[PDB]
Design a protein around this ligand. Structure first.
Ligand SMILES: N[C@@H](Cc1c[nH]c[nH+]1)C(=O)O
Ligand SMILES: N[C@@H](Cc1c[nH]c[nH+]1)C(=O)O
Ligand SMILES: [Zn+2]
Ligand SMILES: [Zn+2]
Lengths: 433, 433
């Protein structure tokens, strides 16, 4: 009479893996006309459109779009001392890890007299979108704001929608103010993305927009690309894949699965085990722990689309994981150092029984803004790299151009580009003269 | 009675810069329905669609889509010994510079018992598009194929359209075969992009597609993103901005401008000088050199949209350049080391009188696949980074989770994510027990 929440597959053949790696289907609504209409309103009516759309969708009639300093001060006083300490602990770890990603200038002499190198420069105008609601995901403010600051980005904008009384959750404002974000705007949805894409009287336009959101925000960011703005990565629901052998702790594994499942009804979790007893013990823990979750309804909906799979070796589990390309990968196995080289697609990886995903979500220092829905095949998580341009430099000397010059002339000839050839020829004749 | 090709502006006010940074307008045709129709045909008819569209647009009725080994061998014998030597010289320099971009693993202890790091992994399936025509831009094969190989990308596909006899230019095939690309397909245009986006019987689908093309290829790459593939960067016509003081060589500067102008009628060049005499001498050189260009008609059309501007200091020229954000920047000035830190947006930078753009186009080692039309504000040129994912790793010890655990619990509580809190709690209670 037991109500099993997650479906299981015991040693499925390789011919079924194509089906077992599938995420749940997503909504197929065409939002292009909806987005383009909002964008046209933002282009034509600017701040008035922002206020009008906020009235319509957030049920708040604002006078000012920008969060005031009194509102920031009021928010600071509403954050407890213990939370302040935790946020500062997280910010320090995130700052330390992202600061380590800065590269040293490295001048390469490719051939005699030819020196080449790269240098980073910040993307000047950064836009950050933060969804609203009663539960503030203020940790995303740290994840996106801190590397923007470290990169040297001069203008950081944060948009987040008000509640019906016009207010922003105090933890969001506290956290943004902590890391030095001063341009905070009461705006959500398509209209917020449009404001950062085209600019209004109050919001200067962004060069690149960061941060996930719902289906409407996702479509708006996708379409905004066609008007010249860059975006961080494509969006989708969050997910975890866990690999567990006999050394895994079933209580820990169940808690990790449920931590991902409680994010949303569209989340997906995958458990790969090397024997059935680990699977059975972990599922028993899932059932028992699920009863205690305030969000048990949401996690239960995500578990319907989730899968537990028994595969007869860790190397087979890794091969399945590499085909799935998970946003988060937990290796709950012995001697992970023997296996990490074999991982080829995963957004972020957690090693051994004490590396829980919650730690990466909040405080370890890695970035939790990660590619989902298989985008780990072709994107990275947000990092310092996301906030800079790498400019290439070269300095060719007189000996340098005498060295590579004749070869360039022959290639330009073959491409039938006479002016390209002549730009070399005039240098060579000048030194020969 | 002189026919001046380029328009000049002498000390324009700062209020006019907004207008002087504008590229020429681009075509505003809506190609979405056109692209989606081809994509539907590729999805439904696969190789048959590839052959049918090739018949229609390339006027070649193919039997085989894949270039054969006999065709590769025939192409090798049609490339001269002197060109072979030049291509190998270029490949060596490109390989050396891109190999230097590999990062070392760097384990960061963010706090006691918490170790975080990143590792690169190749994007597994790479697609490269190379336009056809009588003038083979085979240098792009080196620029995209070499870093793909260095990254460890296992499956590299190259699509390039046949001529009416079904043939591919021998320099393209020679160069692709040289750097180890074995999967070469006779296909162009929207249908080639669609084949790499969805896959056919002959062409395995790509995870990321590289390489610029015409308006149709550009729209296809943009729309292909919505079906899950990554692309290198947005497209547009090529451009150069030159900054010249009294130490510049007007013959060299004119040749550099004309080298960019001969690329296409939609190209744009910008010359900034610190005095009018440099401008006048350079324009005289442009007029005289233009008469000798086989492509003088194309360069003349690009010069119509080009601008020469006198500004009264190098720092003003740099500020103009930073607003323009050029694909290529040439600093034809004294003591460039005093100015490169002030450059904030540019795709690739060339220093001093002997650093011509042709050298970067062909042989210096930097990548010539660069962001144009102002995309240097928010994208980089192609590099080793373009072909990899940077996966984050963390290993938290028992002491580590005891260290950051309580803080995570408080933040999870504030985000009302009880399962996130519980995933930490079970570890702490286990060690406390
Ligand atoms: N070393 C570079 C930083 C960089 C990042 N990527 C390439 N270069 C600098 O001086 O800014
Ligand atoms: N050091 C990494 C390479 C890397 C690039 N970016 C981050 N890490 C490795 O072992 O592959
Ligand atoms: Zn989470
Ligand atoms: Zn060129």
């Amino acid at each position: 009479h037991h109500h099993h929440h997650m479906q299981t597959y015991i040693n499925p053949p390789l011919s079924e893996w194509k089906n077992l790696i599938q995420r749940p289907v997503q909504k197929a609504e065409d939002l292009q006309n909806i987005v383009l209409t909002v964008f046209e309103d933002i282009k034509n009516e600017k701040d008035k459109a922002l206020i009008n759309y906020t009235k319509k969708f957030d049920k708040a009639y604002l006078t000012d779009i920008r969060v005031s300093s009194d509102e920031i001060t009021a928010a600071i006083a509403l954050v407890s001392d213990e939370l302040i300490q935790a946020i500062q602990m997280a910010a320090s770890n995130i700052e330390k890890f992202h600061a380590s990603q800065k590269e040293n200038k490295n001048i390469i002499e490719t051939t005699e007299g030819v020196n080449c190198w790269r240098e980073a420069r910040p993307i000047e105008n950064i836009g950050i979108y933060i969804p609203g609601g009663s539960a503030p995901l203020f940790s995303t403010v740290l994840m996106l704001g801190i590397p923007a600051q470290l990169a040297g980005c001069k203008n950081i904008t944060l948009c987040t929608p008000p509640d019906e009384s016009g207010n922003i959750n105090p933890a969001i404002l506290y956290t943004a103010n902590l890391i030095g974000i001063k341009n905070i705007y009461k705006a959500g949805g398509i209209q917020a993305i449009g404001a950062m894409t085209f600019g209004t009287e109050t919001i200067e336009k962004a060069d690149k927009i960061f941060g996930p959101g719902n289906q409407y925000v996702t479509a708006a960011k996708q379409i905004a690309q066609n008007f010249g703005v860059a975006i961080d990565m494509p969006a989708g629901p969050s997910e975890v894949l866990v690999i567990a052998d006999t050394t895994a702790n079933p209580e820990f594994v169940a808690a990790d699965l449920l931590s991902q499942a409680e994010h949303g009804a569209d989340s997906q979790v995958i458990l790969l085990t090397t024997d059935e007893n680990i699977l059975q013990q972990t599922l028993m823990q899932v059932e028992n722990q699920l009863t205690q979750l305030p969000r048990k309804s949401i996690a239960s909906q995500a578990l319907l689309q989730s899968r537990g799979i028994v595969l007869d070796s860790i190397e087979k589990c890794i091969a399945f994981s590499n085909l799935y390309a998970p946003e988060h990968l937990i290796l709950a196995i012995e001697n992970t150092e023997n296996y990490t080289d074999k991982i080829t697609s995963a957004g972020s990886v957690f090693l051994g029984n004490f590396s829980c995903e919650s730690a990466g979500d909040y405080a370890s220092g890695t970035n939790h803004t990660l590619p989902t829905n298989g985008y780990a095949r072709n994107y990275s998580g947000v990092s310092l790299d996301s906030f800079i341009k790498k400019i290439t430099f070269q300095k060719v000397t007189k000996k340098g151009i005498q060295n590579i010059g004749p070869g360039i002339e022959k290639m330009a000839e073959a491409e039938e580009l006479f002016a390209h050839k002549h730009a070399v020829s005039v240098r060579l004749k000048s030194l020969n003269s």
